[PDB]
């Protein structure tokens with residue numbers, strides 16, 4: 001049973017997640033994903049969520065007072081607050097496994113230059129906070145990262161949704177001049193396992209030498 | 213100017229998407245898309261036949277064929293810069309255990325093909341990776357190291373937490389140095405590999 005709350009100024013971006021969820025898992029009370037428009041917690045008629053950065057620089061910073069009110073309402077002491085950020089700790093499969101047994105994830109999606117740091121720092125005094133990055137590239141905001149995190153985590157929750165994997169093949173045995181490796185059709189399953197292991201070793205050397 | 217075509221059995225997942233156009237295609241338009249793996253194993257493999265017909269129609273020899281896969285080369289900001297000046301990206305999104313390897317191999321005989329991974333975690337398919345790649349690339353299209361440090365805005369005091377006084381000082385050199393120190397401190401703590409140190 002996991003609850004995920006996502007807070008964002010672009011609620012529509014999280015539409016795929018809602019679609020990804022099988023009815024059986026929702027009906028069994030195994031998972032609930034709710035998406036919240038950050039502007040519900042704005043203070044002014046202009047529904048302001050950002051303001052100029054102290055110390056100067058380009059871009060804007062999301063307002064602490066708005067985020068503070070949102071997280072005050074949504075989070076409890078048991079919440080794991082997830083904050084995507086290009087400056088975060090790396091989100092890995094190990095992370096996904098750890099988070100898959102949490103009762104309550106709240107994902108705070110920023111835009112612009114990010115969220116005033118006091119939001120996370122204040123929250124960390126009353127709950128667990130994790131600033132994470134999904135990879136070494138730059139996005140426009142946290143929403144695509146939330147999609148990735150939600151999928152990676154929920155597929156590890158029962159019935160909700162190292163070396164590199166080698167190539168896979170299926171029918172037909174010959175296609176556009178290319179035959180499936182004959183070893184795979186040999187019925188020698190110890191040999192097939194060794195062939196697959198060597199394919200994986202070769203691919204890891206070529207594509208991810210860092211893993212070795 | 214860039215054209216992006218995305219091919220998927222779940223076109224609805226791509227909904228979050230003048231100098232750039234993005235089109236989404238249902239792979240099933242070219243047909244059962246999957247079958248059991250040769251050599252055994254759990255799960256299913258996407259058939260090369262359907263993919264071949266799809267890519268035949270959508271791709272040219274100019275196309276950069278992008279194939280998300282957990283076994284890919286890393287997609288990084290460098291990749292995003294490289295791809296930002298391409299005329300035509302086609303992103304082939306797999307499901308199940310992935311796509312028959314011959315699809316990429318066949319395609320590489322007539323176009324440039326890039327198998328890439330957006331990170332060291334496992335997804336159920338290529339679609340979320342496609343969304344990440346598109347976002348990272350499009351923001352670099354003409355006409356559109358170290359970890360960044362913390363940012364602050366008004367009010368200068370909030371819940372008894374102050375904005376670092378240097379940021380209020382108006383001293384550009386001191387502000388630049390404090391920010392450099394914050395960034396290097398964050399990088400050592402969170403991504404020591406970026407500075408050539410062992411990971412945790």
Ligand SMILES: N#Cc1c(-c2ccc3ccn(Cc4cccnc4)c3c2)n[nH]c1N
Pocket residue numbers: 084085086088109110111112113114115132133134135136137138139140141142143145360
């Ligand atoms: N996780 C993760 C990320 C993000 C990401 C996450 C949240 C935000 C909120 C704003 N931006 C834009 C921005 C651009 C430049 C500097 N600072 C901020 C975000 C980028 N980018 N790349 C990742 N792997």
Ligand SMILES: N#Cc1c(-c2ccc3ccn(Cc4cccnc4)c3c2)n[nH]c1N
Pocket residue numbers: 165280281282284305306307308309310311328329330331332333334335336337338339341
């Ligand atoms: N880029 C990227 C990815 C993917 C990814 C991309 C395409 C597909 C097509 C199917 N699956 C599920 C699957 C699961 C396990 C083994 N093999 C395949 C995909 C996962 N996962 N993690 C990433 N960083």
